[PDB]
Amino acid sequence: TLDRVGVFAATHAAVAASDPLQARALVLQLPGLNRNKDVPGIVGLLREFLPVRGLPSGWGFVEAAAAMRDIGFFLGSLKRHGHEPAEVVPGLEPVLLDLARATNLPPRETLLHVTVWNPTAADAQRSYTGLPDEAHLLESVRISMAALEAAIALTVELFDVSLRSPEFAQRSDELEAYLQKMVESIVYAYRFISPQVFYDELRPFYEPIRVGGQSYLGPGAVEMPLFVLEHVLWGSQSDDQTYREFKETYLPYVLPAYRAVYARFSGEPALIDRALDEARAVGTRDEHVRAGLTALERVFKVLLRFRAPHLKLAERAYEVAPSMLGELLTLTYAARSRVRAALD
Ligand code: HEM
Numbered sequence: 001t002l003d004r005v006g007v008f009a010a011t012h013a014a015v016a017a018s019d020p021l022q023a024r025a026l027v028l029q030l031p032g033l034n035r036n037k038d039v040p041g042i043v044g045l046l047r048e049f050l051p052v053r054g055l056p057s058g059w060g061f062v063e064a065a066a067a068m069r070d071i072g073f074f075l076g077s078l079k080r081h082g083h084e085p086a087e088v089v090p091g092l093e094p095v096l097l098d099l100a101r102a103t104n105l106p107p108r109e110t111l112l113h114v115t116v117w118n119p120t121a122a123d124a125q126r127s128y129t130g131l132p133d134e135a136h137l138l139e140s141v142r143i144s145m146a147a148l149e150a151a152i153a154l155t156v157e158l159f160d161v162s163l164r165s166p167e168f169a170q171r172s173d174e175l176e177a178y179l180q181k182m183v184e185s186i187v188y189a190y191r192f193i194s195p196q197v198f199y200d201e202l203r204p205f206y207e208p209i210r211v212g213g214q215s216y217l218g219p220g221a222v223e224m225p226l227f228v229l230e231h232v233l234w235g236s237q238s239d240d241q242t243y244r245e246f247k248e249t250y251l252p253y254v255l256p257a258y259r260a261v262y263a264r265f266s267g268e269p270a271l272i273d274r275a276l277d278e279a280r281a282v283g284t285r286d287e288h289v290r291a292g293l294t295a296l297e298r299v300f301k302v303l304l305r306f307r308a309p310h311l312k313l314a315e316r317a318y319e320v321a322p323s324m325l326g327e328l329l330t331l332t333y334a335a336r337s338r339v340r341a342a343l344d
Pocket residue numbers: 140141144182185186189193194195198220221222223224226227307310313314315317318321322325328
């Protein structure tokens with residue numbers, strides 16, 4: 001039914017199935033060490049598989065990203081106990097920079113490494129804490145990530161589709177159905193994840209680390225390239241500084257394609273800006289214009305069905321949240337309102 005998801009999931013699975021450092025049984029031991037707060041043990045465990053003499057030259061993106069995933073869980077772990085991994089692990093930083101080069105991504109772990117590039121089986125899944133809530137946390141992202149990537153593709157395609165065309169409404173309705181997975185993610189999180197366990201036990205593992213003379217943020221669903229999708233959809237031309245800064249902050253953490261998608265659309269008006277300009281020039285008595293705008297409004301409706309419940313979720317945990325959440329929600333409502341005013 002959401003048939004575009006399959007190829008994305010299949011590329012994720014290629015990385016999930018890769019164990020080039022033969023680290024599976026070793027990374028499974030990390031949660032026990034984190035529970036004991038055993039920093040020397042954690043370093044000693046990494047040094048058991050960490051390449052000291054470089055990366056095998058037969059490797060490609062898949063193996064390098066898999067290697068970054070396995071070393072990566074030790075990065076957030078060591079920082080969680082108060083230590084810069086690059087300061088406490090000999091030869092680690094060069095390795096991290098080599099993997100950042102091989103994958104064209106930061107020299108640490110990201111959301112991608114800890115979720116969709118991370119195998120799902122109990123005898124294989126990598127984790128910081130080994131907690132049920134962490135298992136649930138990773139799954140919440142696996143629900144929607146492949147659908148999100150498909151949604152980005154659909155958004156780029158929709159950009160060049162004229163509102164006068166019946167394709168616009170059809171494409172808009174299809175983009176909605178993919179973004180509905182974002183809502184499924186939140187419903188799943190609110191049902192299965194303890195806010196208190198997240199804040200007290202999970203969140204301490206996602207702090208920044210210093211590599212190469214700069215700071216790199218830890219894994220978060222904030223790194224999901226939804227912001228790129230909405231760059232193209234509504235936000236590219238926005239003059240909100242805080243929002244611009246927010247997008248530029250997480251940009252390095254997404255796949256290179258989406259960094260390129262983002263670059264391509266910064267110089268153009270957003271989809272919403274073109275669609276509304278077209279609607280005012282043609283008229284709303286054109287049925288394809290009416291259906292186009294109606295379906296586009298439902299796209300904004302589903303984004304809000306993710307974003308509003310997600311704010312409550314974050315505030316519930318931080319009751320045990322960064323204000324940008326509220327600001328982004330307000331912006332999205334304004335965009336939806338513009339689409340509504342196009343029909344009222
Ligand atoms: C208890 C669970 C969760 C908490 C406490 C939480 C909290 C937060 C916080 C505090 C931010 C602000 C950015 C920052 O970290 O500084 C944020 C942003 C974000 N989060 Fe979550 N989150 C949770 C679950 C999820 C889930 C399940 C998803 C989707 C799978 C998700 C997707 C996003 C996205 C896409 C953003 C960027 C802002 C936006 O699009 O509105 N989060 N979240």
